[PDB]
RNA sequence: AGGUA
């Protein structure tokens, strides 16, 4: 995984420091970002009311 | 709000009219219970003091 | 899915939701509803076997009231062979199983909006119209034969607004493709009204206004409140021996 | 809005008959016949009763004595 | 067989004694809400309070009959929305977890109208409900009569139930994210920007932190006025220098007057925060405790977000 | 007391990519200006977007015509990303008309004098039949922010024509904003930094006009702060 | 296009020190934009006057005891940071504090100049006990922008001075505290608006409303060149 | 019946 990240010109640790949107000030220490496969389950709030 | 049909109607009318108080009444479930117990060979009654 | 396990292709192909080419050849015709394949010479039966036609199931109600449609993932002139994915079914792209979506996520607390196991979601997600599902729900209006008189479907409904009449045809059925919301009338069902009991105040009011009780009561199928959407398909089933209507 | 009823509990230590007395006060407040004694912020009778009890204007005794005096002018 | 039932008699108590004027929906976090209030979606609020809407509409005379009010509310015109805000403003509503294990499973909150479809629940209260936001559904009940409204405000209210009925220690305790934020804010390093500085008031500490001239945690001497409940219940203002960290002073800004500074001049875990709330309640009372709990929730969330605490593959 | 930031070289590494520099900025102001401009650009940028589309052959979003390999919903989705600039009119109705096999792209739209297609290669659909013909009326209007077709449909009450299809309009022209404050070294004043704003936009809004509009919005907001009502 | 502007700004204040200003309605996110911008302007860079260098006629160290004074040098230096001084003349000016006798040495004991105005007439600076019962020094008060810690100042100062010039952190900015809270707000049926709550504690050198308005003036003054 | 806590 780290080798493939190096091929992508990305930090080896997999953590990138992110700048907040509200204040425009970066968080102390890097934060883990990445593309995760996320699923929308059949429990939609519209059906639940 | 559960089983007292007369109390439920009176509450709805009171809230629409802008008044907040209730008739304790008797839930219809309990009257069903009384009639169903009487359906057996068992007497059940409501006695005053 | 960016991070798969290799069973995505097998699951997508083996399930019936994917239109798979039974006999290889050259794609002769591509359409959102039809895919016509000119079979190869070495795969046709003796005589004229001709073409292979695949009709794509589109926007059909599943058992969970979710849309299932198949989109063509091939183009004209593409050479295909047996076992190839001609059309990608629901939650499937390029022959891979594609239930959800791959999204950029950051693991960090954010003003407590993601507190227990909660997710915080950017407006870009709804802007990209991703994770936007299509729910095809089913509604049934049955015109029955009651002892008060046979029910009928008609556009003219007593004591209703003209907006309701607007969306129906002369047959009392909403047009295919009309946008409806909760409470709108879809089928103009009416039931032969029986004997009517009137309170003294009702009798006084009918004496005043000159109105009298309607011989037929409204029984039209309204959209249940809380749901919206477009009428994409209308089915009419009239049993044999009963007169057909215009919409059928 | 009344976030806490602890100050009201201080005046009426039972914390249950507090509900009864403030409910009586608020019902006389909503049902016509009685006029407020504390300024409102477009609020219903409940927080009015809480504020009235909190400043000591209304408890069980004041409500009872007031219903007497009103009974005496209406009987006249 | 109709009499004999499980659990208990069916129609009477269970199953199940259904109730009117109730709703149900999925719950989400309410991190901006005050403790005594909860987010209630506009649609559920409208449907729940239809008789109230009719009553107020006929009171101000915008509808001449109940039927006209029904047409107005189903059209959902902007007129009925102000009526709805008025009826919600003071009316408390009961929030209920699907399983009810103890009396904290039902708590009153002031509903706040929100566009959307899920009930926003106060983060501090989810511990009492044993509710995690993973699809849990909660029900809302409307206490109709004035006696019931008052009864909910006095007893059902969350702020009235800050302590567990099984033990005196508070049940509304900062739990996970806010605890992490507090810990990161109070935990001290060995070297950081702005060590050895001398500060007066925690206000200079917050100024230095927000300006980036110092670090959130660094050993600093700060002059702070701690108040002690002494004599007969009178505040004793003692102003002196404490060796602490910037984050600790920033937190001390939040802490209401009357508590010893030693309570925050330490690494704060879950136990530390729970003990600190218990001490605050015992020393000050109810209202300072509720205000301090809400403020500590806000501070913990904010400084957890600013922390950027993340779990990687290397940690 | 202060020196004044001035619009300096605005380079275009790409048609959709713009790097705009602001050199004479006081230290401590770079992050403030950068964050403020980022917020304003992502939030309140006026832009042109498609709102309603009338396709002759179909009656709703969930149908398909002959000779097209993309569902009508897919055509609407592709049109959502269509990049267009209108100058004189706030609302325009473009006509798309093409028959014959081939990829129907954005350049095929009948272009008016006030309407510019900045992404002519943006494919709209594919016609896979010789006699298949597409005729569409695409309504493009001006707006800011994100207005989906579930809010103005409540303000229109089931729009009377059934042949028209409403799409969610993402009027935002800018897709990505970043700002870097770096030490701008210049002879006058020892403490100065420059703000480099790297912007990815759909080409509908020029970076110069973008920055000017963001500054105008920020100044209008600050106007309330300048004069306080007591 | 059509742009929304805040209506009916409300301000509730405590003395000339602690003001809460609520502003609504603000369009999506604008509450955070304005709050963060104002907070950075007020904190990082605001013109003001502050104490920079101090004398101690006794020990010329910044952490040793002072004879005749029941306060060590570090905390008497700290006392001067809280001293709110507004100078209306030349940028750098020297104030001589010379008073004998036991008791609290406060700001009233400092001589008043035509260019320097003492905001707080009673403010604890020192305490004098029996031993020498005399306190004496000269203090630099300088005009500057923002907050300049002493540890940073010596880094930015290569011109050396004889030992006795005790450097102190200067808070030129008049605000001790600035915070903004963004909360949901309602207008008509659109609920995406937000209230901006600016809670700010100032030193009294300037009224909080004046502080906010001049901060916004500085921001817009930075801006105009962008707008045409 | 399956699914959710």
Swiss-Prot record, chain C:
UniProt organism field = Escherichia coli (strain K12)
What lineage, starting at the top, does this entry show? Bacteria, Pseudomonadati, Pseudomonadota, Gammaproteobacteria, Enterobacterales
Q: What domain of life does the native source organism fall in? A: Bacteria
* Subunit description: The RNAP catalytic core consists of 2 alpha, 1 beta, 1 beta' and 1 omega subunit. When a sigma factor is associated with the core the holoenzyme is formed, which can initiate transcription. The rRNA transcription and antitermination complex (rrnTAC) consists of RNAP, NusA, NusB, NusE (rpsJ), NusG, SubB, ribosomal protein S4, DNA and precursor rRNA; S4 is more flexible than other subunits. In pull-down experiments interacts with CedA. (Microbial infection) Interacts (via flap domain) with Escherichia phage lambda antitermination protein Q; this interaction renders bacterial RNAP resistant to transcription pausing and allows it to read through termination signals.
Whole-protein residues included: 698 to 945 of 1342
How is it modified post-translationally? Answer: Acetylated on several lysine residues in the presence of glucose.
Q: What does this protein do?
A: DNA-dependent RNA polymerase (RNAP) catalyzes the transcription of DNA into RNA using the four ribonucleoside triphosphates as substrates. Resistance to the antibiotics salinamide A, salinamide B, rifampicin, streptolydigin, CBR703, myxopyronin, and lipiarmycin can result from mutations in this protein.
Instruction: Provide the family line.
Output: Belongs to the RNA polymerase beta chain family.
Signal peptide stretch: none
Q: Which gene name does the record give? A: rpoB
Swiss-Prot record, chain D:
Instruction: Cite the entry's keywords alphabetically.
Output: DNA-directed RNA polymerase, Nucleotidyltransferase, Transcription, Transferase
Keyword Transcription applies: yes
Reactions catalysed: RNA(n) + a ribonucleoside 5'-triphosphate = RNA(n+1) + diphosphate
Enzyme type, top EC level = transferase
Q: Where are the transmembrane segments?
A: none
Question: Would the keyword Transferase turn up in this protein's UniProt record?
Answer: yes
What EC number is given for this enzyme? 2.7.7.6
Question: An example of a Gene Ontology BP annotation on this entry?
Answer: response to heat
* An example Gene Ontology molecular-function term: bacterial-type RNA polymerase core enzyme binding
Which GO cellular component does the record give, naming just one?
cytosolic DNA-directed RNA polymerase complex
Q: Which family does it belong to?
A: Belongs to the RNA polymerase subunit omega family.
Q: How does it assemble?
A: The RNAP catalytic core consists of 2 alpha, 1 beta, 1 beta' and 1 omega subunit. When a sigma factor is associated with the core the holoenzyme is formed, which can initiate transcription. The rRNA transcription and antitermination complex (rrnTAC) consists of RNAP, NusA, NusB, NusE (rpsJ), NusG, SubB, ribosomal protein S4, DNA and precursor rRNA; S4 is more flexible than other subunits.
Its protein name is DNA-directed RNA polymerase subunit omega
- What stretch of the complete protein does the chain hold? 2 to 77 of 91
UniProtKB/Swiss-Prot annotation, chain E:
Q: Look up what happens after changing residue 176 to P.
A: Resistant to antibiotics salinamide A and B
How can this protein be applied?
Answer: Co-administration of salinamide and rifampicin or salinamide and myxopyronin suppresses the emergence of resistance to both antibiotics.
* Binding residues for Mg(2+): 132, 134, 136
Write out the PTM section of this UniProt entry. Answer: Acetylated on several lysine residues in the presence of glucose.
Where do transmembrane segments lie in this chain?
none
What is its quaternary makeup? The RNAP catalytic core consists of 2 alpha, 1 beta, 1 beta' and 1 omega subunit. When a sigma factor is associated with the core the holoenzyme is formed, which can initiate transcription. The rRNA transcription and antitermination complex (rrnTAC) consists of RNAP, NusA, NusB, NusE (rpsJ), NusG, SubB, ribosomal protein S4, DNA and precursor rRNA; S4 is more flexible than other subunits.
Q: Which family does it belong to?
A: Belongs to the RNA polymerase beta' chain family.
Biological role: DNA-dependent RNA polymerase (RNAP) catalyzes the transcription of DNA into RNA using the four ribonucleoside triphosphates as substrates.
What is the recorded name of this protein? DNA-directed RNA polymerase subunit beta'
Which organism's genome codes for this protein? Escherichia coli (strain K12)
Q: Which residues of the full protein are shown?
A: 329 to 643 of 1407
Curated annotation (Swiss-Prot), chain F:
Q: State which Enzyme Commission number(s) the record gives.
A: 2.7.7.6
Q: Region labeled Required for interaction with Crp at class II promoters — which residues?
A: 156-159
* Keywords on record: Acetylation, ADP-ribosylation, DNA-directed RNA polymerase, Nucleotidyltransferase, Transcription, Transferase
* Alpha N-terminal domain (alpha-NTD) as annotated region, ranges: 1-229
Question: Can the keyword Acetylation be found in this entry's annotation?
Answer: yes
Q: State the Gene Ontology BP annotations.
A: bacterial-type flagellum assembly; bacterial-type flagellum-dependent cell motility; cell motility; cellular response to cell envelope stress; DNA-templated transcription initiation; intracellular iron ion homeostasis; nitrate assimilation; regulation of DNA-templated transcription elongation
One Gene Ontology cellular component term attached to this UniProt record is: cytosol
Q: Catalysed reaction per UniProt? A: RNA(n) + a ribonucleoside 5'-triphosphate = RNA(n+1) + diphosphate
What about PTM?
A: (Microbial infection) ADP-ribosylated on both alpha subunits by the phage T4 protein ModA. ADP-ribosylated on only one of the alpha subunits by the phage T4 protein Alt.
Keyword Transferase attached: yes
Q: Which GO terms describe its molecular function?
A: DNA binding; DNA-directed RNA polymerase activity; protein dimerization activity
Q: How does it assemble?
A: Homodimer. The RNAP catalytic core consists of 2 alpha, 1 beta, 1 beta' and 1 omega subunit. When a sigma factor is associated with the core the holoenzyme is formed, which can initiate transcription. Both the N- and C-terminus interact with different regions of transcriptional regulator CRP. The rRNA transcription and antitermination complex (rrnTAC) consists of RNAP, NusA, NusB, NusE (rpsJ), NusG, SubB, ribosomal protein S4, DNA and precursor rRNA; S4 is more flexible than other subunits.
Report which gene this protein is encoded by: rpoA
């Amino acid at each position: 995984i780290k080798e493939l990240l190096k091929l992508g010109d990305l930090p080896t640790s997999g953590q990138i420091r992110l700048y907040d949107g509200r204040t425009g000030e970066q968080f102390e220490r890097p934060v883990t970002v990445g593309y995760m496969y996320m699923l929308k389950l059949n429990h939609l709030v519209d059906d639940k009311m | 709000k559960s089983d007292d049909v007369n109390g439920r109607t009176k509450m709805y009318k009171n809230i629409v009219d802008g008044n907040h108080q209730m008739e304790p009444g008797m839930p219809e479930s309990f009257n069903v219970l009384l009639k169903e117990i009487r359906s057996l060979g068992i007497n059940i009654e409501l006695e005053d003091e | 899915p960016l991070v798969g396990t290799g069973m995505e292709r097998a699951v997508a192909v083996d399930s019936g939701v994917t239109a798979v080419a039974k006999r290889g050849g050259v794609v002769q015709y591509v359409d959102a509803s039809r895919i016509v394949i000119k079979v190869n010479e070495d795969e046709m039966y003796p005589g004229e076997a001709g073409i292979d036609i695949y009709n794509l199931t589109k926007y059909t109600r599943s058992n969970q009231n979710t849309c299932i449609n198949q989109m063509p993932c091939v183009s004209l002139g593409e050479p295909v062979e047996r076992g190839d994915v001609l059309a990608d079914g629901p939650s499937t792209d390029l022959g891979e199983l594609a239930l959800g979506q791959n999204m950029r996520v950051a693991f960090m607390p954010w003003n407590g909006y993601n507190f227990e196991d909660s997710i915080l979601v950017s407006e870009r997600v709804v802007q990209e119209d991703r994770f936007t599902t299509i729910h095809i729900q089913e509604l049934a209006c049955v015109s029955r034969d009651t002892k008060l008189g046979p029910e009928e479907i008609t556009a003219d409904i007593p004591n209703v607004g003209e907006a309701a009449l607007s969306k129906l045809d002369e047959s009392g059925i909403v047009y295919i493709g009309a946008e409806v919301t909760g409470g709108d009338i879809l089928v103009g069902k009416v039931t032969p009204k029986g004997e009517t009991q009137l309170t003294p105040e009702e009798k006084l009011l009918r004496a005043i206004f000159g109105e009298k009780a309607s011989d037929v009561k409204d029984s039209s199928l309204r959209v249940p409140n809380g749901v919206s959407g477009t009428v994409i398909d209308v089915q009419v089933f009239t049993r044999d021996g009963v007169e057909k209507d215009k919409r059928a | 809005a009344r976030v806490t009823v602890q100050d009201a509990v201080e005046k009426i230590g039972n914390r249950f008959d507090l509900v009864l007395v403030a409910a009586r006060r608020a019902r006389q407040m909503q049902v016509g016949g009685k006029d407020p004694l504390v300024p409102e912020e477009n609020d219903k009778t409940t927080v009015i009763a809480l504020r009235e009890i909190e400043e000591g204007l209304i408890n069980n005794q004041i409500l009872d004595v007031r219903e007497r005096q009103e009974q005496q002018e209406q009987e006249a | 067989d109709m009499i004999k039932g499980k659990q208990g008699r069916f129609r009477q108590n269970l199953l199940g004694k259904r109730v009117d004027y109730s709703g149900r929906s999925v719950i989400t976090v309410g991190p901006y809400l005050r403790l005594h209030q909860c987010g209630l979606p506009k649609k559920m609020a409208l449907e729940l309070f239809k008789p109230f809407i009719y009553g107020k509409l006929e009171l101000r005379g915008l509808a001449t009959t109940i039927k006209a009010a029904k047409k107005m509310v189903e059209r959902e015109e902007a007129v009925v929305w102000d009526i709805l805000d008025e009826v919600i403003r003071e009316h408390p509503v009961l929030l209920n977890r699907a399983p009810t294990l103890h009396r904290l499973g039902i708590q009153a909150f002031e509903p706040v109208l929100i566009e959307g479809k899920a009930i926003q629940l106060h983060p501090l209260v989810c511990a009492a409900y044993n509710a995690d936001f993973d699809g849990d559904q909660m029900a809302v009940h409307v206490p109709l009569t004035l006696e019931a409204q008052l009864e909910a405000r006095a007893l059902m209210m969350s702020t009235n139930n800050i302590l567990s009925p099984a033990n005196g220690e508070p049940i509304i305790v900062p739990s996970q994210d806010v605890v992490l934020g507090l810990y990161y804010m109070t935990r001290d390093c060995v070297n950081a920007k702005g060590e050895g500085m001398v500060l007066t008031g925690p206000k200079e500490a917050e100024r230095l932190y927000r300006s980036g001239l110092a670090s959130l945690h660094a050993r600093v001497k700060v002059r702070i006025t701690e108040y002690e409940k002494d004599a007969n219940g009178e505040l004793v203002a003692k102003t002196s220098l404490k060796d602490t960290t910037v984050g600790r002073a920033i937190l001390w800004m939040i802490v209401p007057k009357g508590l010893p500074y030693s309570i925050v001049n330490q690494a704060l875990g879950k136990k530390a925060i729970s003990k600190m709330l218990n001490t605050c309640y015992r020393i000050l009372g109810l209202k300072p405790t509720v205000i301090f709990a809400d403020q500590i929730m806000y501070t913990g969330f904010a400084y957890a977000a600013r922390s950027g605490a993340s779990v990687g593959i290397d940690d | 007391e202060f020196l004044k930031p001035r619009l300096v070289d605005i380079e275009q590494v790409s048609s959709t990519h713009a790097k705009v520099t602001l050199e004479p900025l006081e230290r401590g102001f770079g992050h403030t200006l950068g964050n403020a401009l980022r917020r304003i650009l992502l939030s309140s940028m006026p832009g042109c977007a498609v709102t309603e589309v009338e396709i002759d052959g179909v009656l709703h979003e969930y149908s398909t015509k002959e000779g097209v390999q993309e569902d009508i919903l897919e055509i609407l989705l592709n049109l959502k990303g269509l990049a267009v600039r209108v100058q004189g009119k706030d609302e325009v109705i473009l006509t798309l008309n093409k028959s014959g096999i081939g990829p129907v792209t954005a350049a095929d739209i009948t272009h008016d004098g006030d309407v510019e297609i900045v992404k002519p290669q943006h494919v709209i659909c594919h016609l896979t039949d010789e006699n298949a013909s597409i005729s569409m009326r695409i309504k493009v209007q001006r707006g800011r922010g994100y207005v989906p077709a579930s809010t103005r449909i409540h303000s229109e009450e089931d729009e009377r024509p059934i042949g028209r299809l409403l799409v969610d309009a993402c009027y935002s022209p800018v897709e990505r904003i970043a700002y870097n404050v770096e030490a701008a070294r210049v002879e006058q004043r020892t403490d100065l930094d420059k703000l480099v704003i790297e912007m990815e936009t759909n080409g509908t809004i020029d970076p110069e006009e973008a920055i000017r509009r963001a500054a105008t919005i920020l100044a209008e907001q600050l106007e309330a702060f300048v004069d306080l009502r007591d």
